[PDB]
A and B are shown apart, each in its own frame.
Chain A
């Protein structure tokens, strides 16, 4: 009775949602994420899974701030206004 009968007793929800990665991988009893390892400061990732790093790497999100860094450098980190703009 390890098959169809035993799957009916399965309503316990071992893993819950994680605050850091948003995956349903936060172990409820250990309070440790199985994906990003979040009781801790350092995000979890290993070199034996190239796909796992690829899914989590820097180019996979919005890049709310790094997308502007490239443009700031190309102009040499300017400050001020373009030589007589309207309004102070």
Chain B
């Protein structure tokens, strides 16, 4: 809601910075296995559970 309860608003800030794709330069690190962000979250797919 628009009434946010600052503790809750602090979790929402964490959730949107975490929802980013992986930098390109990580895919070239001489022994890398990381290929794509497997913890991607979308508001139409999965609930944050707050």
Contacts and interface: CB of A to CB of B under 8 A. Distances in A.
Contacts of A17: 7-8, 11, 50
Instruction: Tell me whether chain B's interface is mostly helix, strand or loop, or mixed.
Output: helix
Nearest to B8: A17
Q: How large is the interface on A (under 10, 10 to 19, 20 to 34, 35 or more residues)?
A: under 10
Interface in B9-50: 11, 49-50
Interface residues of B, number: 5
Nearest to B48: A24
B4 to A, nearest CB: 14
A12 to B, nearest CB: 14
A17 B12 CA distance: 13
Nearest to B49: A24
Nearest to A15: B49
Contacts of B7: 17
B13 to A, nearest CB: 15
A62 B11 CA distance: 20
Contacts of B11: 17
Interface of A: 17, 24
- A-B CB proximity, top 4 nearest: A24-B49, A17-B50, A24-B50, A17-B7
